[PDB]
Amino acid sequence: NILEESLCELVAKQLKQHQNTMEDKFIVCLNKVTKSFPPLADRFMNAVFFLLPKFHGVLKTLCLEVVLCRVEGMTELYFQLKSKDFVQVMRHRDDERQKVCLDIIYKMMPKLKPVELRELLNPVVEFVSHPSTTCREQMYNILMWIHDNYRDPESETDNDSQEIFKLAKDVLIQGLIDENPGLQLIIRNFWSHETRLPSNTLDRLLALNSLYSPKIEVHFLSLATNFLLEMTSMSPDYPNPMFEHPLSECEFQEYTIDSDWRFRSTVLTPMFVETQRSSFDWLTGSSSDSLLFAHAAGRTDLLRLRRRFMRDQEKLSLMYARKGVAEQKREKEIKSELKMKQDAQVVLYRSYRHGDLPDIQIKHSSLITPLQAVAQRDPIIAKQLFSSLFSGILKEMDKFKTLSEKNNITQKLLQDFNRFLNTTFSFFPPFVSCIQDISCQHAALLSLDPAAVSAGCLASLQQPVGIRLLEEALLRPPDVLRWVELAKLYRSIGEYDVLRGIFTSEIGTKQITQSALLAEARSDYSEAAKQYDEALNKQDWVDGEPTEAEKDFWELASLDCYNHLAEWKSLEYCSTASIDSENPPDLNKIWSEPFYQETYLPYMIRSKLKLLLQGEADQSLLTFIDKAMHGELQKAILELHYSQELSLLYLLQDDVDRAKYYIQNGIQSFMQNYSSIDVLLHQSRLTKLQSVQALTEIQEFISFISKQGNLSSQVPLKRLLNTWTNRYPDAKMDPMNIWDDIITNRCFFLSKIEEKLTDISSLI
Amino acid sequence: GVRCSLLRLQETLSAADRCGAALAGHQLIRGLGQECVLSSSPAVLALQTSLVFSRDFGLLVFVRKSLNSIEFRECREEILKFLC
Amino acid sequence: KYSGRDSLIFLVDASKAMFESQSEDELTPFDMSIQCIQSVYISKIISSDRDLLAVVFYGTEKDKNSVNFKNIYVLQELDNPGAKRILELDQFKGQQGQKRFQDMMGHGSDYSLSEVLWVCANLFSDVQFKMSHKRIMLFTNEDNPHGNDSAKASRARTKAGDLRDTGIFLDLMHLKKPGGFDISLFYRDIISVHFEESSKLEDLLRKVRAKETRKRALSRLKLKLNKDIVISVGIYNLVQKALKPPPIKLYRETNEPVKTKTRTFNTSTGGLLLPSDTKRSQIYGSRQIILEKEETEELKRFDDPGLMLMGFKPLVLLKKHHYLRPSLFVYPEESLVIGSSTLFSALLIKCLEKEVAALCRYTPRRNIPPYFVALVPQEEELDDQKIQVTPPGFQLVFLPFADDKRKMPFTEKIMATPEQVGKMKAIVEKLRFTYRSDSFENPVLQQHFRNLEALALDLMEPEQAVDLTLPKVEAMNKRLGSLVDEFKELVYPPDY
DNA sequence: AAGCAGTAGAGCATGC
DNA sequence: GCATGCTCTACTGCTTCGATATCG
Numbered sequence A: 001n002i003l004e005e006s007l008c009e010l011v012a013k014q015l016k017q018h019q020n021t022m023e024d025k026f027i028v029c030l031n032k033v034t035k036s037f038p039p040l041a042d043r044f045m046n047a048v049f050f051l052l053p054k055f056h057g058v059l060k061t062l063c064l065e066v067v068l069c070r071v072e073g074m075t076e077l078y079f080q081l082k083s084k085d086f087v088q089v090m091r092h093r094d095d096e097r098q099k100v101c102l103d104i105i106y107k108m109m110p111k112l113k114p115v116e117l118r119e120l121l122n123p124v125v126e127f128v129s130h131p132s133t134t135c136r137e138q139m140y141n142i143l144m145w146i147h148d149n150y151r152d153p154e155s156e157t158d159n160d161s162q163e164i165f166k167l168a169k170d171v172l173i174q175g176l177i178d179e180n181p182g183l184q185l186i187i188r189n190f191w192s193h194e195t196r197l198p199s200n201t202l203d204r205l206l207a208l209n210s211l212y213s214p215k216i217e218v219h220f221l222s223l224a225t226n227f228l229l230e231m232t233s234m235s236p237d238y239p240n241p242m243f244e245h246p247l248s249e250c251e252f253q254e255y256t257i258d259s260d261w262r263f264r265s266t267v268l269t270p271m272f273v274e275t276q277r278s279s280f281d282w283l284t285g286s287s288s289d290s291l292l293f294a295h296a297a298g299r300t301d302l303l304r305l306r307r308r309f310m311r312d313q314e315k316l317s318l319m320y321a322r323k324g325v326a327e328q329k330r331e332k333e334i335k336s337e338l339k340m341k342q343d344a345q346v347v348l349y350r351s352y353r354h355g356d357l358p359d360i361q362i363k364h365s366s367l368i369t370p371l372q373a374v375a376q377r378d379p380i381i382a383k384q385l386f387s388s389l390f391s392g393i394l395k396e397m398d399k400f401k402t403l404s405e406k407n408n409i410t411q412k413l414l415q416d417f418n419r420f421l422n423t424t425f426s427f428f429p430p431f432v433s434c435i436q437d438i439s440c441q442h443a444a445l446l447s448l449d450p451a452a453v454s455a456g457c458l459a460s461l462q463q464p465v466g467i468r469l470l471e472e473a474l475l476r477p478p479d480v481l482r483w484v485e486l487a488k489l490y491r492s493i494g495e496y497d498v499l500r501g502i503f504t505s506e507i508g509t510k511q512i513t514q515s516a517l518l519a520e521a522r523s524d525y526s527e528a529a530k531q532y533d534e535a536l537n538k539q540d541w542v543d544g545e546p547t548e549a550e551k552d553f554w555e556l557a558s559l560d561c562y563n564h565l566a567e568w569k570s571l572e573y574c575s576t577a578s579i580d581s582e583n584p585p586d587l588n589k590i591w592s593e594p595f596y597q598e599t600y601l602p603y604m605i606r607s608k609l610k611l612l613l614q615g616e617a618d619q620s621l622l623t624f625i626d627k628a629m630h631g632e633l634q635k636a637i638l639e640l641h642y643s644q645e646l647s648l649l650y651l652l653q654d655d656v657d658r659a660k661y662y663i664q665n666g667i668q669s670f671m672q673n674y675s676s677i678d679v680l681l682h683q684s685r686l687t688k689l690q691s692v693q694a695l696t697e698i699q700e701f702i703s704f705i706s707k708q709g710n711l712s713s714q715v716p717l718k719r720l721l722n723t724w725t726n727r728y729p730d731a732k733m734d735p736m737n738i739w740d741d742i743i744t745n746r747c748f749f750l751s752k753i754e755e756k757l758t759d760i761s762s763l764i
Numbered sequence B: 001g002v003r004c005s006l007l008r009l010q011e012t013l014s015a016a017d018r019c020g021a022a023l024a025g026h027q028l029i030r031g032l033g034q035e036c037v038l039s040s041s042p043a044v045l046a047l048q049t050s051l052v053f054s055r056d057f058g059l060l061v062f063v064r065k066s067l068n069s070i071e072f073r074e075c076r077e078e079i080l081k082f083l084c
Numbered sequence C: 001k002y003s004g005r006d007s008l009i010f011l012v013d014a015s016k017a018m019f020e021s022q023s024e025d026e027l028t029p030f031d032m033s034i035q036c037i038q039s040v041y042i043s044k045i046i047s048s049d050r051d052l053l054a055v056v057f058y059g060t061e062k063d064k065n066s067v068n069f070k071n072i073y074v075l076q077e078l079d080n081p082g083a084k085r086i087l088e089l090d091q092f093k094g095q096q097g098q099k100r101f102q103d104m105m106g107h108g109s110d111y112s113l114s115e116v117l118w119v120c121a122n123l124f125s126d127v128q129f130k131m132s133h134k135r136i137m138l139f140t141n142e143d144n145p146h147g148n149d150s151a152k153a154s155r156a157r158t159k160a161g162d163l164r165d166t167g168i169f170l171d172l173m174h175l176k177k178p179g180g181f182d183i184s185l186f187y188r189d190i191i192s193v194h195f196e197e198s199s200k201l202e203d204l205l206r207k208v209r210a211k212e213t214r215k216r217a218l219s220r221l222k223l224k225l226n227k228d229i230v231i232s233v234g235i236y237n238l239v240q241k242a243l244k245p246p247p248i249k250l251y252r253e254t255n256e257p258v259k260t261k262t263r264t265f266n267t268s269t270g271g272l273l274l275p276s277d278t279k280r281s282q283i284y285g286s287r288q289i290i291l292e293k294e295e296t297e298e299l300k301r302f303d304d305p306g307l308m309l310m311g312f313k314p315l316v317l318l319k320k321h322h323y324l325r326p327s328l329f330v331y332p333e334e335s336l337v338i339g340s341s342t343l344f345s346a347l348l349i350k351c352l353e354k355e356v357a358a359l360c361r362y363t364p365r366r367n368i369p370p371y372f373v374a375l376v377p378q379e380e381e382l383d384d385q386k387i388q389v390t391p392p393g394f395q396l397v398f399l400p401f402a403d404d405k406r407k408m409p410f411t412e413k414i415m416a417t418p419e420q421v422g423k424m425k426a427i428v429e430k431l432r433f434t435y436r437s438d439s440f441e442n443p444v445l446q447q448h449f450r451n452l453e454a455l456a457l458d459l460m461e462p463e464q465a466v467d468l469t470l471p472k473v474e475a476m477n478k479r480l481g482s483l484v485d486e487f488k489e490l491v492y493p494p495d496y
Numbered sequence D: 001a002a003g004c005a006g007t008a009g010a011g012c013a014t015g016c
Numbered sequence E: 001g002c003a004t005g006c007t008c009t010a011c012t013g014c015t016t017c018g019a020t021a022t023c024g
């Protein structure tokens, strides 16, 4: 209409009168107008930007919503948002404001050069830990756009574009374990699309190792086998029945199975009672507010316009209060019936028809989908399924590929697996034993890495797998690296019987290593360390100066001997004075040269903590621990692997709260790490079980010293001493590091309860 | 989450742009206190309690070290309203 | 509004052509702008120190803005004036300050006037206070910047429209520019005839140093006629006896305030004594009258606060020598009662006919005894450039009581001969001048301002304000040329 | 002791 | 006998001014 102009200029004249007197009303009126007509905000945009750094409340949310409408019709917008501190308004904790900030970013991304998208990206990737699924969903939307539009469109893009792609890919990988059933499904269908992971199974199996990222290691094997068994669901033999002929002839009815979380099991009923872009999973089936009051034309839905309204506001408020009483009484039910509906809500995957004989006419789906369904839950069965699929697919690679492409498939697989074993920090036992089990089977992967294999299955207690891999590599000049790493694997499970026949003089090793091992076999560790450290400073070798892996073996075994005796001063000196050059030792250099983490760190923490636990007041471990908690990786390493060390350390400064958190973390870490060791790895499970007593003594001490009645008399102390003097590891079977843990922890607990307590001392 | 918010809170106290540091500090305090209030698992609640009442970082040493300053009184007001 | 501050950005064109001034026994335009900015800082630090000021340098190589734009240096944000902000600007003074300026700022760079107006708009945006006026003073000597280009020119005119939409008004302090300053090439359309230096820099170098308060109302009373016809007024003040600001007790080793706390305690037991367990006494020889702290404030309350009209009176009974209190000024406030302005205007232009004045009982505050006060009406005087000197309303003239007057002793009336009166009329006609209203200036207060300036900026010695209330003995003598000796001979006997 | 801007929450309407 | 906003009242901070007590 013609009347556009005289009306929009009238509305703009009233808003122009507003924008200088009351800006609080100017932005409310402008937000309400440009909810519906956005071209009015074009003439007010610099006066919205001017007022934007002034409001801090809901009014800044309204200002940003006015900005959000005109993002495509704005030319620069990054310099204006950067002047107005957009990165710091994104970190304001408000879900509406953060959602509108992320929506502004999403609309202005196809007009950003990489040098400013990289500045915007560092606060965007902080929304992984955001509680709202709406902001996380918007973050995954903009990262999916970055992945689709930054896959090197030209010959060699700059460093900015490459780092942008790397950061987006890291967070997009990390969103495959997202704690929301459907955000994870969006990210999983994003990755399972044909343009990102291929459809060829031999090349999908290679592209799967690109999306590893040490964060997701507990989930990687189930995710990989999910992405691999995607492709069965688009095969022309997938809904076909696997056997076309039944055993005999009988008709089969339809059997529906009652699986509801009310009668979960048969045991909870007494007797008779008074009755007589894509969110889709291929596995579980195939499954603001306005002020205008005028915001269907039928024949049944317009008899509810025959409405009465009680003009008894007192009675109406009484009915609403009684209503809210009923809702408060039903919340008390729902917040228990939903915590019961969480642990007995099972889904069924197959079809289940019943007859007179077993119905051997299952589809291929009725075997594949429960297989992936249980690989998604149990990690051992995911390890076995991934090993089976990887070995089968490389076996069926032989008819396609000839020799020129097979070799640079296996070179890429060797590079990928070396990357896995060199960057894992959570040495997850199914993951480590899976990629050291699929390496034994194929001879082109037997050249994996000797020191990464040794460190991995020493940290995950999976030493038989690494022993089999190293021995098969020594099959097929002596390879002294592999012989020394194999001997380091054998030494940690005991097995000095095997160790005698390794260090003869045909592999090039010295005689001092054999003599020290023969002394260590009879548990004569002081005479073993006496010549280990003697060999570690000797430079006049009359048959060749020793190779480096042998000297690393002497270093590690001498540290083990000092740990085995009790010598905590020599242990901290030997673990500490090899990471620093000068006489002041800088303990924070232990996090570079990744040798230092698996070599010197457990002995460093253990020796300093034992010296703290018996007397000495050198506060040099607490500084290292608090400095290491600043990093997002070092904190994960420390609270995943030690946490009992940490619980005792925080108990030493009377911090019984952080010690509570760390001992509960240690118990959960015990259960997860114990139940993921394969069942026929006995003495791996024995050494995982040997450590539960110290965890529960720390928990029992915390529970004892927390109750105030325990500190009143000497009755509960006498009962605690009466149970501690009957609770021991067994002689002849539990080693001396277990005994030293129990006894040193118990002595420190008794000293703490004594100094807190008011003939008690003779009893303790 | 928390302890990152607390270390950035202690960093926004020796900064050079006062009254520009306090707005960031107030947002750190608000998100921190929101996380501490909305927890119900007694393992992480003891961790968050020990981090809030910590002596290196922590809200009490924040309001102590930010007490010779008028730009930080909204931060101190929000901390004392969180602690109740 | 009222709490709104005044903001001002000094924009100095420190590019290339203010550093090679063509006389060398004169003053370069960079030094002229620096002296001007420093005089405005020293004036506003005690005139109105709640205002906000900033100085930005463009055409300089190094940059310190928030957007990290090319060649914009923001030396200071918008903030209240201080001593250190003048001591930082001291460094770029004189022929040496150029050299002190080059090594840490930059010079001669390319720039964009759009980005410097952008940085000034961002400075006005980052202010959390409320601002009344927002101004940008532009110290420049080149007319037509970006003369090689027109994209820069049209972008600059656009960004000036962006500035004037939000209420920011820039004005240019044009410098010398040998070859005139052509104001029409670039600076007639950007801002709200060849020239020489200016007409604003020179009176901007005149430091005024006099405190200025905003228009508060001091009372909002109701003017009642009997009990029923009440209208609302405001009692403003137009003369108020400016004082010096009071001192602040510091701690000598730190120079920090020290938080005075006064308490009452009895010397018997040394116990802290509340306000409830004291009374107030007066001793008259032997009687002791003992009231309470509540009852001593009951003695004063007579009326309710407001103005009670008590009739009308010709001005001929309002004696000019009946003065005890500086007058106030009433004015109708048409928001506490409606039509107040109409009844005020009818009463005003009807007491403006004759010389009649309303008589009132004035109770300003609550427990305050009344004063009889005379509401003399006054018209308004204005000019064609809408400068008004007298606002319309009444002047509230305080009248003394019987005990506010005092009596004189008996003095003989010794009149003069008309020869003496006619020869003293020549003396008073010789010395005649024009009293404006504000030609004189408080010397004690001025010297306090000068001493505080010189002690906070630690200059070299306190400047002395040239006195003005003092009489000029030699000039009055030479004006009264050879007259006073014959006058005192004709009226005074030849002795002493 | 009162003007004057700024805000926070108390008290209340309302909900069909 | 509850839940959710909305209005608007009452308070604070800052600043000026005036009345009172005190000091060279």
Ligand SMILES: O=P(O)(O)O[C@H]1[C@H](OP(=O)(O)O)[C@H](OP(=O)(O)O)[C@H](OP(=O)(O)O)[C@@H](OP(=O)(O)O)[C@H]1OP(=O)(O)O
Binding pocket: C319, C405
């Ligand atoms: O006769 P009144 O109207 O009552 O006033 C007269 C007189 O007025 P005139 O000038 O018309 O004679 C003087 O008035 P002012 O000089 O104050 O304007 C006044 O003088 P003082 O108040 O200064 O004393 C005083 O006359 P006097 O000075 O002789 O006392 C007074 O007469 P009353 O003393 O009787 O009031």
